Symmetry: D2
């Protein structure tokens, strides 16, 4: 019973109904103010912002800030993530990652090609296809230039057209016709780009902004090599995604897009050949930084879902997995089921942490995990206070730490200059599992230390 | 310019004015319901509760739950602590610990003896001095019996009457005339009790409930041997505390008390000889458990203030110290001033962490510190999210950890059964200090990454 | 100016001249006594033994015990290794590993095919090719059966005949016509066996015993995939090795062999089709166990030479590398040149240990290195006492340790049952490098603390 | 059945009988050559040297070098230590430390005062008591000046004359009448000196050279406060030591001395008032440095015996304790009895290492132990190769390490400049204990892997 939102207009109408989006009619400068407005919103847990009037381009193209920031909906901080993934506004952290991990066990659903889409109501070709017609947000003071892609999806196919990857990567503006961005060889955009370099031809590309809200989550997900995001999205929502043919390149793009930037990557510069957009386009942005923004609510969250699916595929009894937002997507929490010993009869607590480390180390996501804490599932790892309490009271100050050295996340902060320069540094797995213990010996709180009738009576008096 | 609240009535009238206390007129059972009501309040950040009607004793003696729990006052979660310590309702974590540490550098102020006090308006002697007249709260299902003292102060003097210690220790009820509690030889109540055992005489004692709100904070503070709490309280508030002579023992007690239990500790059982109380007495309780209760807001907080004073007395450039409530008073955070290298020219980051560890290890509080994180003072350690972000992004997953083994806190959770049985286990100091770095290279947030006029303009549009 | 010994007779005549081989004319039982005689010899640093008379087969086939054990030659414990590798009887540990590592930078020398060889003076075919004609030594009480190969070389080619690997692996006798041994898929015998399994044909093989003494050292060496041992041996000695065609299989075998066992590996059982041998054959054995035997003098030694070549190929300033015999080939010592900082200007001591760990982790030999100690080259790592002194006085008891977890050596002793069962466990790199220090501040000994004339004068008086 | 050697002449006559002392009749310079001659002797395991003719003083006073260096006696490297402690020339490492630890459980034996002694046959008083009459050896190039005491004993009493400590401490010559040396407040010479400073009087002292060989071993032993060395020596040998009254100070000195230097320590300079000596005096020296010298054979050895006695007094099942000479007295090895689990039923391997660490940390010797390895007693920790093999094959590369930080040995090499400057650094306890294992699963050697008759038969053939 999914509640898939089919485009950004539907997503915004649902946020509006829950008073979780605010319109700003005063002029906002894309030079630093739009980015600062997004940071204020994340950090104060404000409503998403629709910047209706931007210096330089006026009311032509709106900007959506904090598209999946923490929500203002009372009692539902994950509501933007939940709604983006077609779940109830009050879906829990565990229901979200479990829904994504469950879809990894299902067969991919091929998309369907539609003849027309609102994203092509307006078409700009040749010299008219110029990025100077749209906002060029300078998101942070020290950035190298305007970051045109922070929440949109890059689409590239292999030369034969048999495989297509969808990915969010940062793209910076050079001028009105050119953009640039990194093509890491360990990522899929780079692997596909190498195939176009071997044939000696420019790689065709498309960048879509403001699609249905589920796409940027799956485009952030580190799926295995050879698994298409569009197929996974189809299996996740239980129906085909509708794609439309691009106007100047042989690529299929989401029909739900607000804006489509088409072109070729020269053998790294993106060259714009066409820009298509629906009437009154909206360009979402994501302003990465300290917690909590979409680096944490989308990228780290879908990385936790992928870890949960990989650990379960290795038959480990993992109740849930989560990348705590306060740890800025540097940490993975792995919670084992209460009966993990019955499910894995031959291993001690140290043994199951060794096995988790071994399984995670064989996957694509291992370098992202600066720390993995292994805990019992009486802890909700999305509850900041309960998670800090469990780590402080269950992880020894000296033992239960399994260090590995190898490839590291170059964006992670906890590395020395030498470790960064070598791309070689430590990653740890910390054992916070308890021995078999009665609920009242490991807890001391309202819900764990008082009989049901006493709690009921207190709830009647106070709630 | 202190704003000292002189008794519990004044404290409660100030909480009432800020809508931070709620009266419960329905009957509440001291058998588990009062304790459960206190846990619900802590965990939901509710107003302090005045339980006006208790099963067994009716409206005779009221119970105050969550006397210094987190406050409901908007934007002021530490308001109960701040008001208890005579500070503004909005005093920050740093102003609180800094005010306490500043008083450790001042000369003690001797108390003054008053002839009469409201705590002696009603006097019960002999067979009338029976604890069965007052509530006997069973605070948690598995407790050994009713805990009569969780927030009151125990007063004991040395045989010569030259030195008096005030301390909060748990006291359990045996029957109407007797109570029991531990007398650890490493603590001051035990050290003073040994002097009464050498002379072969029962130690006189007094337990006061519901005093002025500052007393339980200083009675929780692990001050050095030979420093009286009453003298420190006097130096802290900048005026003498008023004491009154006890009716059946040669002891001075706070004139601000709600209830005074007098007696002798038999050579360990407390035997009640007299009970005195003011009209409509209030018996506060503290229901220790998971975060956040007075174990964290008072005991861990005053332990952080004592650590800050000890580190500063060793000439270390410590900006602030704090025991994060989410880590259940297991962790100390030590923040160094930005110019610590100018102040300590001969030490590297590792060197200053070694020095901090050496200084803390020579003090009475070292065994309580399961982990100490050493960080820069651009982090507010009382901000849960910023603290977790700083630890995750600045503490290496492998290096910068200084482990010591020795005496441990027997109540701390992060120890194995063998470490607890030996009383011997690990304590760690973790280095999260950064090399010299520009603000924009170590931060990415609203307040650190945008110019003042851009932030002002965003605040005008959104706040 | 190599001094290559061309067969086992020449090797034995050189040991005889230095009184480093002893003949035992009394009968010795291959059931445990030959193995026990080899252990006594290793452990007491006795001469190599020529067992002239064996129970069951009499004087037909002699056994050579401790072929490369520590030598009795005064002042030359490595003499058997040195002579085996064509070096002077007094070649140092460093000259040995440096000679092997220098040959890794030279082009391979193709062997030459000779028409006849002494190893085919006697030929046994069909039912006559029966292992019951030769000794079947039970080397240790608890072994599964007789180990026929402990010091001989297994020869296998790829189906096309374009690539040949030579390797020492343990082979156990089943009966007179069959033997068995492990074919690990991570080793070359297994990788080549997989190619014969794909075609669905039995893999032809040959096992040679008692070849020229240099062959078992290179057959123990973990060379990169695609580097033939015969080509390396040729480059090392500076001349082609002479091979002869096997009688019943399309394989080339060393013409210097004492015995040649030919056959096919059935898709794991070795089936004997022919046995050829020179008059008065000698079957060498190696009896692995505690230090010091050929596990240490040959396998660990050639593994240190391969590590030295790999570290130098990555441009690291490595003076020498060594696997100390007392650590039973569990440890690698890496010594840096005195001017390593001038050669690697951008790295601290920690940084160069990180780089060494990164380089070693990318190679085939990483899992063998349970511990790597990185030291200065003022330490001779082949001097037991100086090495223990340098580790104790230069490796911090807490810091400078870089742990990695991954594949482990299943034969290494320092792993728990769970780490062995998972094949996953810790390997460490320990930093024992000093800061720049004057010779007299880091040494206190005869050769480092007294002027040249004072030492000369003492040598004149005492030596 | 002790074989106590009563003076240095008897000790030297016993070494002579075993060809373990060599006389050098050629002139040797005390300026560097005597020290270099001692280093050559230690490092080449040469006989002890009697330097009969010294530049400057001729044949007046002989020098004994390497008094307890490793012995030349075949199969008995510890013979000088064994003979010094009244044991058989072939006493094992374990018999030596066990004999010393057994004496710690016996009542002290008061000495006896004799009227005359050979050490007073020649008496120098006033201006004749001048150190320029005796050799002034400059033992190492960079020393601050001549070290007059390296193997002799300093004798000091408390002002009341109720307690006397005997200790070896380095004493440097200033001129003919004055010497200097450190008086560490944590050591006994300093503690006794503080009592003479409180009364405002110079502390009388005596330095004895060339006593009976057992005295420098006990004068090196870190016995508890209040245990006199003379009483311990008496209990160890099972008879009273004979003392003689000093000529110019109220002190008793060993009657077995070669030379007695008497005087007062000025409130730190030793001032010489009298020198007494027996005919043809011998002045022994000890030239500390790299292994192996008396720092290792005496100081570290008696420290291992004291650790063995302290661990046994805490009821730990310790088979033996040893400070390996190759680790330069930086390491303690603690071996547990095979049945330690039966003797300590409630502890795991980690638990017993925690308990050992806790017991050692409460003693005077804890700061000396940079590393403690806890092993099973199937390992002889005095066998260099077996010890290195056991550490490499039984101590995990990552786990089983218990680090403590605290006071360190300022002479130990394994500390950074910051740790030395603070006097604060890490000390580790490493767990090398095995789970219950059959002899053949943990050993592979001649004595452990072959039946008794097979070994007997091999010994008959080869030994
Ligand atoms: Na992708
Ligand atoms: Na106190
Ligand atoms: Na090979
Ligand atoms: Na002493």
């Amino acid at each position: 019973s999914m509640k898939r939102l089919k485009d950004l207009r539907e997503y915004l109408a649902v946020l509006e109904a829950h008073q979780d989006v605010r319109e700003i009619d005063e002029p906002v400068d894309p030079h630093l103010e739009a980015g600062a407005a997004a940071r204020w919103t994340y950090e104060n847990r404000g409503p998403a912002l629709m910047l209706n009037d931007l210096t330089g381009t006026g009311r032509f193209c709106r900007i959506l800030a904090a598209p999946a920031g923490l929500s203002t909906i009372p009692g539902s901080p994950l509501a933007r993530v939940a709604l983006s993934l077609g779940l109830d506004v009050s879906a829990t952290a565990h229901e979200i990652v479990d829904s994504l991990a469950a879809a990894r066990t299902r067969e991919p659903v091929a998309p369907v090609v539609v003849d027309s889409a609102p994203c092509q109501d307006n078409v700009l070709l040749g010299d008219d296809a110029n990025l100077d017609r749209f906002p060029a947000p300078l998101l942070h003071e020290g950035d190298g230039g305007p970051y045109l892609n922070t929440w949109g999806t890059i689409i590239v196919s292999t030369p034969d057209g048999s495989f297509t990857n969808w990915a969010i990567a940062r793209v910076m503006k050079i001028d009105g016709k050119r953009m640039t961005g990194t093509f890491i060889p360990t990522q899929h955009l780079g692997q596909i780009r190498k195939l176009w370099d071997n044939l000696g031809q420019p790689m065709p590309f498309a960048i879509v902004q403001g699609t249905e809200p589920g796409i940027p989550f799956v485009a952030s997900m580190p799926l295995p090599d050879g698994i298409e995001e569009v197929g996974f999205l189809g299996a996740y929502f239980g129906e085909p995604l509708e794609l439309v043919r691009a106007k100047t390149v042989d690529l299929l793009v989401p029909a739900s897009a607000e804006i489509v930037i088409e072109g070729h990557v020269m053998p790294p510069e993106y060259v714009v050949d066409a820009i298509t957009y629906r009437d009154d386009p909206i360009w979402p942005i994501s302003v990465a930084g300290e917690p909590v923004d979409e680096t944490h609510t989308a990228w780290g969250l879908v990385t936790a879902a992928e870890a949960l699916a990989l650990l379960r595929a290795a038959k480990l009894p993992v109740a849930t997995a989560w990348m705590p937002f306060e740890a800025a997507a540097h940490w993975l929490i792995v919670c084992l089921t209460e009966d993990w010993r019955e499910r894995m009869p031959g291993l001690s607590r140290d043994g199951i942490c060794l096995r988790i480390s071994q399984v995670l180390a064989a996957t694509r996501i291992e370098a992202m995990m600066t720390r993995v804490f292994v805990l019992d599932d009486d802890v909700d790892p999305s509850d900041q206070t309960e998670l800090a309490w469990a780590i402080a009271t269950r992880v020894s100050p000296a033992h239960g730490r399994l260090v590995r050295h190898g490839m590291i996340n170059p964006l992670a902060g906890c590395y020395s200059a030498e470790e960064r320069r070598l791309g070689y540094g430590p990653k740890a797995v910390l054992n916070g599992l308890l021995p078999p213990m009665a609920e009242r010996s490991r807890r001391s709180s309202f819900r764990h230390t008082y009989p049901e009738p006493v709690r009921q009576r207190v709830i009647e008096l106070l709630a």
